[PDB]
């Protein structure tokens, strides 16, 4: 790739490269926009961040990542036991047990840190874990009232379809019609603060003591961010402004990637094609997953 910057965070590049066409002997000099996070410099000649470890399969633009409820059923001759006790800790005896053939409608919503679109606690924010005394065991919070997160990618993107071969059409990121803004999310203060003092008083029921909230540890982008899906593109929001209180909006600056590995697998990625137009999604925040230090 031969890339230059964009305009006189969220860095975007305008990269021109030689590309194949419908005929093997002929080439084409086409250009595309690549988010800076999907692309590394060689040492301005750049390179797609995945080419040195694995190939990438871009999504068929007709399928959707829309999470819709899945019902898991048990075969004939088996059964599923549903615990109906409200304040059920998740582990141990359950006094209100009923049997069902299938589970309820479970939406495969992939997210990080914050659990979006889920089942709430019927009363009192319930906390679940294995060995609470062990910090290496993940804690899972489940809110009782859902705070509403409001995300949107404002830039009016356009889809530019290349033709890298007979029937193979790579959809490149075209121009940005209109203003260039910053993708982000809004959640309500005095509501995240109202529901964080709820998670607070339940964290102290197991830990006697002052409790503190901080940001992620550090490392990969998927590990240290509120990575989720929104209208087709994969956001990577920075939640340092959400977990920052020791016991009007709060805006989370989000970056957007196109080369995602999803399941952290051994060399397999997907190129998320650019969604044309404006993207905006609204998601309930029903759950949480923390990690104690010691």
């Amino acid at each position: 790739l031969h890339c230059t910057n964009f305009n006189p965070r969220e860095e975007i590049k305008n990269c021109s490269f030689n590309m194949t066409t419908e005929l093997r002997d002929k080439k084409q000099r086409v250009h595309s926009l690549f988010y800076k996070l999907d692309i590394v410099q060689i040492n301005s000649e750049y390179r797609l961040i995945n080419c040195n470890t694995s190939a990438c399969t871009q999504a068929c633009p007709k399928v959707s990542f829309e999470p819709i409820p899945i019902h898991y059923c048990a075969p004939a001759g088996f059964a599923i036991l549903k615990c109906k006790d409200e304040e059920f800790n998740g582990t141990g005896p359950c006094k209100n047990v009923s049997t069902v053939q299938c589970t309820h409608g479970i939406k495969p919503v992939v997210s990080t840190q914050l659990l979006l679109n889920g089942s709430l606690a019927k009363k009192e924010v319930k906390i679940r874990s294995e060995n609470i005394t062990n910090n290496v065991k993940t804690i899972i919070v489940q809110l009782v009232n859902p705070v509403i997160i409001n995300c949107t990618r404002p830039n009016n993107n356009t889809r530019k379809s290349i033709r890298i071969g007979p029937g193979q059409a790579f959809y490149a990121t075209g121009a940005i019609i209109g203003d260039i803004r910053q993708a982000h999310c809004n959640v309500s203060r005095s509501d995240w603060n109202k529901t964080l003092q709820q998670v607070a008083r339940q964290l102290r029921k197991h830990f006697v003591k002052t409790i503190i909230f901080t940001n992620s540890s550090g490392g990969d982008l998927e590990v240290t961010t509120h990575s989720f899906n929104c209208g087709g593109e994969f956001f990577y929001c920075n939640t340092s402004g959400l977990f920052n209180s020791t016991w009007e909006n709060i805006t989370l600056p989000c970056r957007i990637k196109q080369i995602i590995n999803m399941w952290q697998r051994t060399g397999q990625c997907m190129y998320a094609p650019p969604i044309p137009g404006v993207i905006s999604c609204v998601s309930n925040i029903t759950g949480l997953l923390l990690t104690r230090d010691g």
Partner: protein, 226 residues
Amino acid sequence: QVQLQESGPGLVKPSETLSLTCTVSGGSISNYYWSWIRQSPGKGLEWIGYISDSESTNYNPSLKSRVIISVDTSKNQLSLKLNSVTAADSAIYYCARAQQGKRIYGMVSFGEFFYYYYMDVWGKGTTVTVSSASTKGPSVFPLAPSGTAALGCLVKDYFPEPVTVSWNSGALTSGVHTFPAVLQSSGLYSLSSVVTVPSSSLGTQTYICNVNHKPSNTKVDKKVEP
């Protein structure tokens, strides 16, 4: 409430430093932004530069390496200099009050705005001419008259622009008609003004013109009569 007025030398030799000034009236000088604009024959309005209320400079890339926009907060005087002047730098120079605007299109915290300036009150303008030719005072000759009559004065060979004509030192203003100049092949202009006036007062009320040519400091005045 706030007015402006430019000042200049009228003539500047090539490859020398041009210097102009402006006088702000009815307003503080270190309160607003000030700009400089010039219009040459054949070229549109060209924005030279601008000075801030914090007195910070920012010049057009067309002449960043030749312009110094100073200031004098003791009075209300704004400065401008032009190093190494050539023949193309001759134009009518203006000084206006730039008003800073803040257009916000996204989030003010993400930096999604852009600053834009607009100049609402301008000065009258100062004419400067770039030529190695020397200055020269005019030679106003009177034009005697003859329902109404017409009378004027022939401001002959003079260089450079401009020249001012006033009748009765500003008393007679109705019917005046100062014509544009004429650049002769000899290299210097020639102007003529006239004034239509009732035929009754041809002998009594004296008519006296007043010619001002600052680029040579040759101030003259003459009288017209049959």
